[PDB]
């Protein structure tokens, strides 16, 4: 009642964007990404590091918002965290 009222759901374009920002993120930060996904989605606890799937359709706006918040804080600041 509070969460979704503050954090509106990501549209398809947004979800594509988030798919693109996550893909621009390096291994280091991917650890935080998968941490946010896994910790918000306990059903996805079996996210094998060799084969991590991102299914935004099960991801709550909560996760989608925290993810976007993080990916942007990384890429908008450092478009290339690696050299």
């Amino acid at each position: 009642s509070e969460e979704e009222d503050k954090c509106k759901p990501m549209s398809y374009e947004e979800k594509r964007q988030l798919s693109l920002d996550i893909n621009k993120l390096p291994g280091e930060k991917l650890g935080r990404v998968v941490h946010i996904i896994q910790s918000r989605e306990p059903s996805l606890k079996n996210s094998n590091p060799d084969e991590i799937e991102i299914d935004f359709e099960t991801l709550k706006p909560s996760t989608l918002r925290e993810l976007e918040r993080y990916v942007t804080s990384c890429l908008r600041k450092k478009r290339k965290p690696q050299a």
Partner: peptide, 19 residues
């Protein structure tokens, strides 16, 4: 139904390895 951007990525360092 709708073909959505389902992502797959490999993450270095298996910190989350179940036992």
């Amino acid at each position: 139904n709708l073909q959505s951007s389902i992502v797959k990525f490999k993450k270095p360092l298996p910190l989350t390895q179940p036992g």
